[PDB]
Design an enzyme around this catalytic site. Structure first.
Site, short mmCIF file in Angstrom:
data_model
loop_
_atom_site.label_atom_id
_atom_site.label_comp_id
_atom_site.label_asym_id
_atom_site.label_seq_id
_atom_site.Cartn_x
_atom_site.Cartn_y
_atom_site.Cartn_z
N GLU A 1 4.99 1.22 -5.31
CA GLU A 1 4.34 0.37 -4.31
C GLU A 1 4.58 -1.10 -4.65
O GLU A 1 4.86 -1.88 -3.68
CB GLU A 1 2.84 0.67 -4.24
CG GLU A 1 2.58 2.01 -3.60
CD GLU A 1 2.85 2.13 -2.11
OE1 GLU A 1 3.38 1.15 -1.53
OE2 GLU A 1 2.70 3.30 -1.58
N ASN B 1 3.80 -5.11 7.65
CA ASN B 1 4.17 -3.90 8.39
C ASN B 1 4.64 -4.34 9.77
O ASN B 1 4.21 -5.42 10.23
CB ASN B 1 2.96 -2.97 8.37
CG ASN B 1 2.58 -2.58 6.95
OD1 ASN B 1 1.40 -2.62 6.57
ND2 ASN B 1 3.58 -2.19 6.19
N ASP C 1 3.54 -3.31 12.55
CA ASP C 1 2.34 -3.32 13.43
C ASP C 1 1.57 -4.63 13.23
O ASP C 1 0.59 -4.81 13.96
CB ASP C 1 1.47 -2.08 13.25
CG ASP C 1 0.67 -2.00 11.95
OD1 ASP C 1 0.86 -2.87 11.09
OD2 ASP C 1 -0.22 -1.14 11.86
N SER D 1 -0.08 -5.40 10.42
CA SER D 1 -0.98 -5.23 9.25
C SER D 1 -0.19 -5.66 8.00
O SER D 1 1.05 -5.79 8.09
CB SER D 1 -1.50 -3.81 9.11
OG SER D 1 -0.45 -2.92 8.80
N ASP E 1 0.11 -4.97 3.59
CA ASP E 1 -0.23 -4.20 2.38
C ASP E 1 -0.38 -5.18 1.21
O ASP E 1 0.48 -6.09 1.02
CB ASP E 1 0.84 -3.20 2.03
CG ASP E 1 1.11 -2.15 3.09
OD1 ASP E 1 0.25 -1.86 3.89
OD2 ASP E 1 2.21 -1.64 3.06
N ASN F 1 -3.66 -1.32 2.77
CA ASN F 1 -3.33 -1.92 4.09
C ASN F 1 -4.57 -2.49 4.78
O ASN F 1 -5.66 -1.90 4.70
CB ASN F 1 -2.59 -0.91 4.94
CG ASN F 1 -3.47 0.12 5.56
OD1 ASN F 1 -4.34 -0.18 6.40
ND2 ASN F 1 -3.17 1.38 5.25
#
Ligand code: NA
Length: 129
Positions: A35, A46, A48, A50, A52, A59
């Site tokens: 990650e 992301n 969309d 959002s 992380d 998220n």
């Protein structure tokens, strides 16, 4: 902060993540490796909109507030910035809620694709724990 492998394994163990919801410590270290490469300041946007955040790339769609993810929740009741701290307490506490949500560690797509089913004990091999 960029943790060392065994340094992060010790921090995660101290905060109760070892065998949390049945996931051995190597699972959590493996997920953090892919990650964030063990970097608390890791961020990823992301498609969309959002974002992380942190060692476990938590998220903003569900788990933290960043003020810029329309329609989102903050189920960990934290600012997303807390997930970038050198102190992993917020990341670990929030990971515990995520992994309790029904799909276990599948919530972390990198865990499913790169850790699941592998020899995850190799991630804690040689660490003094
Ligand atoms: Na949010």
């Amino acid at each position: 902060k960029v943790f060392g492998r065994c340094e992060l394994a010790a921090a995660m163990k101290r905060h109760g993540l070892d065998n949390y919801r049945g996931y051995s410590l190597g699972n959590w270290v493996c997920a953090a490796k892919f990650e964030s490469n063990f970097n608390t300041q890791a961020t990823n946007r992301n498609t969309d909109g959002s974002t992380d955040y942190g060692i476990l790339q938590i998220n903003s769609r569900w788990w933290c507030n960043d003020g810029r993810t329309p329609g989102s929740r903050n189920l960990c009741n934290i600012p997303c910035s807390a997930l970038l701290s050198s102190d992993i307490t917020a990341s670990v506490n929030c990971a515990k809620k995520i992994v309790s949500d029904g799909n276990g560690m599948n919530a972390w797509v990198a865990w499913r694709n790169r850790c699941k089913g592998t020899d995850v004990q190799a991630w804690i091999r040689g660490c003094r724990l």
